[PDB]
Write a protein that binds this ligand. Structure first.
Ligand SMILES: *[C@H](C)[C@H]1/C(=C/c2[nH]c(/C=C3N=C(/C=C4\NC(=O)C(CC)=C4C)C(C)=C\3CCC(=O)O)c(CCC(=O)O)c2C)NC(=O)[C@@H]1C
Ligand SMILES: *[C@H](C)[C@H]1/C(=C/c2[nH]c(/C=C3N=C(/C=C4\NC(=O)C(CC)=C4C)C(C)=C\3CCC(=O)O)c(CCC(=O)O)c2C)NC(=O)[C@@H]1C
Ligand SMILES: *[C@H](C)[C@H]1/C(=C/c2[nH]c(/C=C3N=C(/C=C4\NC(=O)C(CC)=C4C)C(C)=C\3CCC(=O)O)c(CCC(=O)O)c2C)NC(=O)[C@@H]1C
Ligand SMILES: *[C@H](C)[C@H]1/C(=C/c2[nH]c(/C=C3N=C(/C=C4\NC(=O)C(CC)=C4C)C(C)=C\3CCC(=O)O)c(CCC(=O)O)c2C)NC(=O)[C@@H]1C
Ligand SMILES: *[C@H](C)[C@H]1/C(=C/c2[nH]c(/C=C3N=C(/C=C4\NC(=O)C(CC)=C4C)C(C)=C\3CCC(=O)O)c(CCC(=O)O)c2C)NC(=O)[C@@H]1C
Ligand SMILES: *[C@H](C)[C@H]1/C(=C/c2[nH]c(/C=C3N=C(/C=C4\NC(=O)C(CC)=C4C)C(C)=C\3CCC(=O)O)c(CCC(=O)O)c2C)NC(=O)[C@@H]1C
Ligand SMILES: *[C@H](C)[C@H]1/C(=C/c2[nH]c(/C=C3N=C(/C=C4\NC(=O)C(CC)=C4C)C(C)=C\3CCC(=O)O)c(CCC(=O)O)c2C)NC(=O)[C@@H]1C
Ligand SMILES: *[C@H](C)[C@H]1/C(=C/c2[nH]c(/C=C3N=C(/C=C4\NC(=O)C(CC)=C4C)C(C)=C\3CCC(=O)O)c(CCC(=O)O)c2C)NC(=O)[C@@H]1C
Lengths: 66, 159, 160, 49, 160, 160, 160, 161, 159, 159, 160
């Protein structure tokens, strides 16, 4: 399956947290292609900004093997 | 394909291929040569299958080729036949693969959404595929026809 | 966010209390509001058709839909029309809001990078957006059309 | 995570079915959410629930 | 503002704005002009409101402006008045927005923590806001005052 | 992933061409090889633990790596290295059945070089281990199977 | 209803109703009497609206009342008219409620699935509703018609 | 779930006995029936939408249920009922291939009565619908297949009632 | 069994059985009669297979039947042979099922844990199974042996 | 990690058993330890004040706090003082440990990148850290101050 | 070492070190000098401890040094003794650290996997460690022995 590597930052506008939040704040992750759409929207709705998107696995414009 | 499906299940389980899985692969490779011939037959008869099925569909559904209907007009009728041709090509691919997965990616995912935007009636499309199956079955030998039927049935089920 | 909030935010960074000039901009928005609401209702009702017409104008009967084209295969076709829907919905939101920011925060952010990885053609997408704009313009009527057009153009410029 | 997603009892039996998943997490290339997704999308989950 | 809130709910649902939601937007835009006038009144009277409220606060709390107290000294007293001015500016922003959200982001989140580091007493700050409310109410007409009161009350509630 | 059969299909699908005899011949070629591959896969699965043991003995152990200050020193690191070896073996077996190198690219090969460089794992030693596994595998599978098995092992090595 | 919607939003926020929200409730209760009259008008004209709309629909779509078509035959034609009547009743309910929710629960959720089993064409149903709207609009006064139109439009949007 | 082949195996495993000729004959019996079952399953899958339509027409629609105040009144409820019908059909097909009723018990039958009672869905009407589906299915599958298909449909009906 | 596996995959996907899946079922039912005979052969030769394999294992691993070793002593040696018998019974079950699932539930899940508590060496157990395979292969015809081999290999892989 | 573990790790890579020279380094740490514990207790008790004083020295009465500044708005102000607390707590941990590694593993890693995305000014933050150091130096007293200073400087250099 | 443990607990709680925790650190630093002496004693006796333990192990387990067994042959026997030496070195490190963590990272994580690839029996390894403990205990004074025993016991528990 095609996979997306995504780097995104989400700021904690609702409440300040004492424990280290660095992993939550700035995260690079591998997303299944199907999941990414929903995830992208969720980051937008949070007000986080998606710094970088790349397709980790799979071939661009593939009819099959997707 | 059969093999792709088996590998994928194994990878999810993070295990080597199970004996049963291996056996199915063995059966498939033996079947393949026969499958290739079945596919070849349909390819040669493709033009006639589409034509005959189209006529049957239009007889079954006068409405589709009527001023209201989507199929109506030369441009539209051509597109309807082109669609039937597409599905036949997909079915041939399926027979050689031994699995519907190749068919499924190209044709069956998002099909509802595409046709709804077009406003083409999905049941009529299904009837066309059924019609194609009947034509294809006649040209194929009985055992060959049964194999081909499964793929045709899947398409009808999908839409 | 919103035209009203945009004015507020600009003043807040300055630290200035709201002033008459600012108030006038807010007043301008309030008059435009009623028109915008009517336009939004029109778009929502005709959304499916708008997409259909725009696709017919640009996307379909094209190389894209033909085999080897980006929008070939049902899956890709469905994806493209889904994207078209989002552009329309967000543009409607922007028109009500009176602010382009939501487009930047929601639609525009991460789109270019996604499209480049996918190999989706930006110019064709822009073409589709412009087509939607034209269809929308008709339905909404002239006064509403001018307002609607700016948000569509904003989306197009972002994608390009 | 094993104990949340499977129950306590089933989580005990796990030896290393998910070792590959663990490594991606250890590497910090997947998030915890993603790791939980994949535990859910697993033959073991399906077999047990 | 109200409009932003409506858009946000729609986006979460991934749906076009409901007729009811649209109606609320219409009502808000009509109300806005009245709201602008209320805000304008307070802005003009801002300097006096702050001054009067400050005096009341210092009378109510001698301690804050005492050698021990945080407010004591010219520099410190100015800062205390500056804070009162800030809160008034936020209130005006709120009235035009029709929501406390603008107020809330700038002034009410982390306020406790900020003041605790400063060592400023939170209750005294609340009293100052209450004092400002009373002054503002007098200048405003009764119905206008009620609208303004809500925003003032929210601030007092937030800083508690 | 992709296999041989699907690869042919996909190439035809982008062309839009129906399957033709030349294509059929490639498929037929695969079908003959298939039976051999299945037998090889079963052999590898049964002897997997030993294959890894032998390969480690040939390259990894009795070496500076295992000695203190070496990458594979400490139980934790030793265990990691043999886990990686197992991965390579399992994926190569999958690839051999499939008749396509793509799965190796999609799972194993992508990002491995970068991971190893950050970790400070030595690539050349890893490659050596893969080559050793290939040699052991070659023996067990037998000559006809060995040629097929070798290409996937070489593919992994080249990627790393 | 409008009030139910407001309460639900408050409950989600876990707060008492806002003054603004309360004001909207007040406006709605005032509007209700006018709304009741609009609903009453349509109820009285119900029989004729359905009849006229049916005829228009059948003219617009000859196919539906053709031997192939679903609507064809007395039994079937009656059922098609009964459906139109149902939708009109729902619209009246909506007008009094001031919200589409009553309409939505009874008629628009699972509608696609129900009609697909029946094999009734959804677009034709939408046309029938559009036809009913036009008849209803003529009997209603202009401002009344606009109110009624919104509910009619929603139905058309839902069945798409 | 369990199937016929596994059921035989499991019975022997608890005994600890190696497979015996009597056991083998039961397995052999299943193997002959198997080919018929596969054909039946394909027929059902292709005609599933129609089967549901016909069965609904026979029992559910044109009835008080569909009329206002009936359980299947409103689009939402109508859609739910046909979804349930589809479930029953799919599971019955699975059971027919398997040659064992157990899957029905494990997935469909367990907790259904309680769910329906809380919902206020009428059990007897549902049973009626299942019986109707059986009749339609019987026609399509043909006689040899019909007997096999019928037992699973009857099993569902008995469970619900 | 094959059929159980197919049904389970379908249910997860919430779909009717795919044509490919159906085809595998068809192949299995045809194979079954042959499979039954293969199983019958091994059952009859069971006693000798176990005996021969045991001897081979003990030759291969002197240690297991040594004072230190787990197998040492009559009681222990009997238990080791009983275990070999158990695995053979499981393999026969597998052949008729056409899948390792029946084998897997009874024998392969928790096997490591059980043997670790017992302190029995897992590799030695695997060798015994390998030994049984060789004996079984000799009695079976070549094609029959290949089928049986797959199940034997799975067991060896599992431990 | 810790001074004690650092010595151990250096020996482990060499593979050497612990030697007197190594022991002497450990002994050196043990003498310093008592002082460090006293310093840590002082810092913990005065932590709130330390932050207050440092903020007064650098952060407040500045453009940052004024509208349009990074620390403007209550939320941002609170965030900045939270960050200051983090630095203080970690520096205290490092001082007890006698090793800078913890700072690298928790505080220093990824902070620069986070700050750049946020638009927080690094130089101002560094200024704040230096201010805290000065305040801390006073409270801890001279012997403790030297030890405390190195960790503060390490944080500053990293940022 | 212990201090690391204390810091880690504090960091999890996000608090400064508790007085009680600080006191334990103080006690540990005082104890360290005594601990160093205990470690020194074992280091000096290391060569003899390993030799004696090896002999005991081989007597206890004839099989390991038998043609089938892993330990059999000079090369292999040396490696088995080297392993025993490694574990002793780890134990000394543990005593000075006051925690098993140093021991654990180097020797106890992945140990099962490493030995399983080697095919060495884990229980025999445990017996060797037990044997080493007995020899070490005899040379150590009673209180010193108890301290050393804990670390030895942990190893035995880990490899089990
Ligand atoms: C204060 C001396 C200066 C300042 C600080 C500042 N920081 C933020 C926001 C964040 N800071 C961090 C950093 C960390 N998270 C961690 O886990 C650690 C190490 C343990 C650090 C140091 C993070 C993650 C944020 C984001 C908020 C959150 O809680 O997730 C701000 C606010 C900016 C914003 O938009 O969030 C500020 C002001 N900036 C200055 O101007 C001071 C000089
Ligand atoms: C024939 C059975 C029915 C019918 C067909 C019909 N189709 C169109 C238009 C299109 N059909 C497709 C179909 C596909 N594109 C793909 O990539 C695939 C998967 C391989 C398929 C099946 C597409 C993309 C189009 C859009 C036009 C284009 O290709 O550029 C029409 C015309 C409708 C229109 O307005 O364009 C018609 C009529 N119509 C019926 O009612 C028949 C039952
Ligand atoms: C249609 C006008 C053109 C087109 C579109 C197209 N898009 C994809 C795939 C994706 N598009 C997006 C875009 C978005 N995700 C979001 O969150 C938003 C904001 C709401 C947008 C606009 C994403 C994330 C994907 C990936 C997965 C998904 O389906 O969402 C495709 C498919 C490409 C592929 O290789 O699969 C297509 C075709 N391309 C055209 O041909 C038109 C010009
Ligand atoms: C007056 C009612 C009380 C009072 C006030 C007081 N405040 C300070 C110092 C500061 N107050 C603030 C507050 C804000 N900055 C913001 O950005 C916002 C949100 C818009 C607020 C409310 C800040 C940040 C400071 C620091 C200085 C600066 O910003 O330039 C002081 C001085 C104390 C000091 O150490 O700085 C005082 C006296 N004190 C009372 O006791 C009164 C009840
Ligand atoms: C053995 C031949 C060599 C070796 C191995 C080694 N690898 C790691 C660490 C990692 N290995 C991977 C790789 C994979 N993860 C996967 O999911 C897959 C695909 C199936 C692979 C191949 C990853 C991601 C890591 C990092 C995370 C983890 O710990 O798992 C190490 C550990 C390095 C360390 O410092 O911890 C080692 C030792 N190194 C050698 O010495 C051999 C040459
Ligand atoms: C008329 C515009 C179209 C048309 C109508 C048509 N409908 C039926 C049958 C039914 N339609 C419904 C609909 C509803 N039931 C509800 O609960 C609601 C919401 C309150 C609706 C809208 C139902 C349930 C039926 C089934 C009949 C029954 O009560 O049992 C038919 C008859 C077809 C049949 O086989 O029953 C027809 C003709 N047909 C068209 O094609 C027109 C476009
Ligand atoms: C149709 C023959 C009858 C009917 C059905 C009906 N069902 C519901 C609601 C539910 N149905 C189920 C049932 C199942 N879930 C399962 O897991 C299984 C076993 C495989 C079954 C059969 C469930 C759980 C629901 C509730 C949740 C949902 O809707 O998905 C309704 C709707 C009831 C309501 O009041 O909303 C109906 C109408 N009712 C009839 O009239 C027929 C007799
Ligand atoms: C002796 C008690 C038992 C025994 C020992 C044995 N070990 C090996 C081979 C190796 N042992 C290790 C172990 C370690 N590496 C580490 O980093 C640590 C912790 C510090 C340990 C304990 C390694 C790496 C090897 C591999 C060879 C090498 O030195 O690089 C053997 C040889 C077997 C083989 O296949 O190599 C033996 C015999 N085995 C027994 O039978 C005793 C009970």
């Amino acid at each position: 399956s095609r996979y997306f590597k995504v780097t995104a930052c989400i700021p904690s506008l609702k409440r300040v947290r004492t424990g280290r939040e660095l992993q939550n704040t700035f995260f690079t992750k591998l997303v299944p292609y199907e999941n990414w759409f929903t995830e992208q929207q969720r980051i937008q709705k949070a007000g986080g900004k998606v710094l970088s998107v790349k397709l980790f696995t799979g071939v661009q414009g593939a009819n099959t093997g997707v | 394909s059969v093999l792709t499906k088996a590998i994928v299940n194994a990878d999810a389980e993070a295990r080597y291929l199970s004996p049963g899985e291996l056996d199915r692969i063995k059966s498939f490779v033996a079947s393949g040569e026969r499958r290739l011939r079945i596919a070849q037959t349909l390819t040669e008869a493709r033009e006639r299958i589409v034509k005959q099925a189209g006529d049957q569909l239009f007889q079954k559904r006068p409405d589709v080729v009527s001023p209201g209907g989507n199929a109506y007009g030369e441009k539209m009728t051509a597109l309807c036949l082109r669609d039937l041709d597409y599905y036949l090509r997909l079915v041939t691919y399926g027979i050689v693969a031994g699995d519907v997965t190749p068919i499924e990616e190209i044709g069956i995912i998002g099909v509802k959404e595409m046709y709804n935007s077009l406003q083409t009636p999905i049941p009529a499309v299904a009837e066309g595929v059924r019609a194609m199956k009947n034509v294809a079955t006649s040209l194929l030998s009985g055992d060959d026809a049964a194999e081909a039927g499964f793929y045709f049935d899947y398409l009808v089920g999908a839409m | 966010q919103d035209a009203i909030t945009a004015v507020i935010n600009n003043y807040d960074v300055q630290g200035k209390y709201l002033d008459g000039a600012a108030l006038d901009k807010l007043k301008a928005y309030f008059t435009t509001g009623a028109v915008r609401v009517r336009a939004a209702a029109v778009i929502s009702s005709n959304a499916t058709t708008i997409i259909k017409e725009a696709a017919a104008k640009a996307l379909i009967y094209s190389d894209l839909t033909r085999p080897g084209g980006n929008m070939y295969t049902t899956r890709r076709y469905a994806a493209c029309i889904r994207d078209m829907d989002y552009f329309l919905r967000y543009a409607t939101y922007a028109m009500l809001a009176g602010d382009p920011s939501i487009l930047d925060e929601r639609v525009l952010n991460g789109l270019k990078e996604t499209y480049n990885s996918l190999g989706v053609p930006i110019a064709a997408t822009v073409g589709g957006i412009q087509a939607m704009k034209e269809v929308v313009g008709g339905l909404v009527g002239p006064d509403a059309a001018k307002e609607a057009s700016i948000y569509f153009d904003y989306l197009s410029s972002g994608l390009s | 995570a094993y104990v949340q997603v499977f129950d306590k009892d089933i989580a005990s039996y796990i030896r290393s079915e998910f070792s590959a998943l663990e490594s991606r997490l250890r590497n910090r290339e997947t998030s915890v959410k993603e790791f939980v997704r994949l535990l859910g999308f697993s033959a073991l989950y399906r077999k047990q629930f």
